[PDB]
Symmetry: C3
Subunit: 256 residues, 3 copies
Amino acid sequence: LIDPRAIIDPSARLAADVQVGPWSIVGAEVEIGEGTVIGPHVVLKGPTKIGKHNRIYQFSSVGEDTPDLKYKGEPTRLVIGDHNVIREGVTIHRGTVQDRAETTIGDHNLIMAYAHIGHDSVIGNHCILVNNTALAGHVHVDDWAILSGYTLVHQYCRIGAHSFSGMGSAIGKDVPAYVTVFGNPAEARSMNFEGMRRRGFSSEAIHALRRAYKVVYRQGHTVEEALAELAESAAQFPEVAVFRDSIQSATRGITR
Amino acid sequence: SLIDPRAIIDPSARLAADVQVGPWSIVGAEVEIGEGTVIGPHVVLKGPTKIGKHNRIYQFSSVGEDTPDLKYKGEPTRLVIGDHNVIREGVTIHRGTVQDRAETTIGDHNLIMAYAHIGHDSVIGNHCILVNNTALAGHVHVDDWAILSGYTLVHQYCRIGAHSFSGMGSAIGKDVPAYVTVFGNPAEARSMNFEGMRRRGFSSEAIHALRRAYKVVYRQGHTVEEALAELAESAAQFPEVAVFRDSIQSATRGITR
Amino acid sequence: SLIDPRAIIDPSARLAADVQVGPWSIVGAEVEIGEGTVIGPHVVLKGPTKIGKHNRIYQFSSVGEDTPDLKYKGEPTRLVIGDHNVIREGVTIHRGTVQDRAETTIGDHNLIMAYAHIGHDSVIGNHCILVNNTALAGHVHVDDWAILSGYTLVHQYCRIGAHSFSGMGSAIGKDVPAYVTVFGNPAEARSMNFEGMRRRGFSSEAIHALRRAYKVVYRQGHTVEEALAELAESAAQFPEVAVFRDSIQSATRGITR
Ligand SMILES: O=C(Nc1cccc(-c2nnn[nH]2)c1)c1ccc2[nH]cc(Br)c2c1
Ligand SMILES: O=C(Nc1cccc(-c2nnn[nH]2)c1)c1ccc2[nH]cc(Br)c2c1
Ligand SMILES: O=C(Nc1cccc(-c2nnn[nH]2)c1)c1ccc2[nH]cc(Br)c2c1
Ligand SMILES: O=C(Nc1cccc(-c2nnn[nH]2)c1)c1ccc2[nH]cc(Br)c2c1
């Protein structure tokens, strides 16, 4: 299962069932969980934890140091959950002590070829990062978010649950939950109604969220005005609280 | 020896005369490689895949991987590559899907530059140039002599017409007619590839007729049906204009405007 | 030992005594590596290439390949890289073409991040940062301390001035004067890199003179030649203004506006 042309550092820790292809490097302090398949020509560096039933494709560099000059070799980590697919040539950097010293990925994420997950980024669950998507650093991607091909995300930006970025988008401000954004610079267009139907949202939840978008984007309310107007919608629908919570946590302004 | 002993050749792989395979390359099951093809070092070939003659594939390329667009792959789905193609460093080419074509198809004399992506069920003709990090999302048709400049992004099902040209960083969401130049995100028509026509040995007559054809379609408020009617006479005189007319006719989902 | 036994070292290669080469790396014929340099695993070095001292080259980089540019027909051309450079994952650097000076040149203390592309005949100075997926198409000159943010695209023959800055996703088709800040596709001139200038310790007087010089070129309706003639005075007083003036005077592709 561990190909004999692979290099497994002695301090690495591999569960039963783990496969490692030829000419891959499982570096010092790299933990891998049961059912995970490392392809050929993968470089893993630690300290890193990889969970269960993950698949990591050739030419990926998972757990290197950020080249960002504000990192100076301090002990920082990367954690990856379960049932993720990391495709060809993905780069994933460990955290920096200036934040939480950890880069974090949840479960059931699909990270397509040549995607870049910068230091200190947090990815939730059931996210899709399409080819060459780049998180510059300290980027938070909530559950079910889809970033289309060559989406560039600026440092510290929050990408909301069920949000969608069009291909070649450049995101400089928080994207609220459910919002669809396009272009360079990114601008809000609508709500991810497909994402909501994928979730089996009641038709009352979807109408509540359709109206919630109007209150924030199409009624000339300021962010403060919107948040108060949404309070009752948010009380009634957990799905609208996700939206309101995402705008409330947007300390530096939302994508318009 | 032409086959480096550090490469992994599957027993079902078929290598023709004068094929070279560099060290640490994988030639997987049902991969066929034609006469005089050079596989670089650190290349992953996955099948079922048919590669023709006098191709060159550079290091860190993943040729014939399954699309990650489906959670559960269909099999068998094919990749077909013709002759005299250059595939540069880190290029990804995905096989077809059982739902659509079941084949990703590349013709002859194409240049696919570093880190370009050719998505499942795409079709590339002959003499095309995909510059660095060009991405064909899926079911993209690129006709003969098209040039896509660096970091050109193409949406699913879009047709890139013969002799067309995309500018650097273009995001293409609708068909590009033959000969048309497009720029920006989202892509906008600007003119025709007059430079390319001259390098192809197009008559000044053909080039003048194609200039007029551009104005008929884009500049004169015609419906497409009206544009097709207005172009019929010029298309019958010039095969070069027929290629333009046919790219407009075949564009069911609209053209880049 | 410092050379991994799984690395390929061409017998013509010249390595200083403390050079490290990781496993499954290639040091090709006529590649020279200076003292203190670390080559990671899975690196492809092709020559004729000279690499200086205390460099670091990461996995999956292709350093010294021929350009795929059709104008290159296999002529003997070179790559020269200086000292204290960092080349991150998957970087591509191509040798020169005889049509220019048969050399691609990189100075010292440069940071070239993952999947950056340095095209044939490019000249990079000292203390430059090319962020992820920056692509220099060919014959691009990047002068000292320039910062090109992520996915910056540079057209052939463009010059990037000293202490200039590009925003993420910039598409530069025209020359960027020294100190100027550009953004967008196509790239737009916004301001000067005042945070760069202050971090580097430029004087308040030089920063004020550069602030006024920006107005002269961009905001007084002067033609390039009229602005150069108006810059004459301040350029004689402040070396920094002369660097600015010179970058406008040396422009081949017009200046980013
Ligand atoms: O972009 C993709 N799908 C998609 C589906 C619906 C709307 C949009 C939309 N609208 N505006 N910009 N992108 C986009 C897509 C899917 C799979 C891919 N694989 C590689 C690439 Br590049 C890619 C791109
Ligand atoms: O739901 C998707 N796209 C979506 C959803 C809502 C509005 C729009 C919209 N609006 N204007 N243009 N595109 C688009 C979707 C689903 C599965 C996918 N797999 C890969 C990709 Br990219 C993707 C995208
Ligand atoms: O940009 C390229 N060619 C080209 C030629 C003529 C007009 C234009 C145009 N005009 N406006 N936007 N792009 C573009 C080009 C050629 C070779 C290359 N190799 C690597 C890269 Br990135 C690259 C880019
Ligand atoms: O672009 C980056 N940083 C940056 C810093 C300051 C201003 C701007 C700016 N402002 N407006 N447009 N771009 C941008 C950056 C830094 C590190 C990275 N690592 C991977 C990627 Br992609 C990346 C991108």
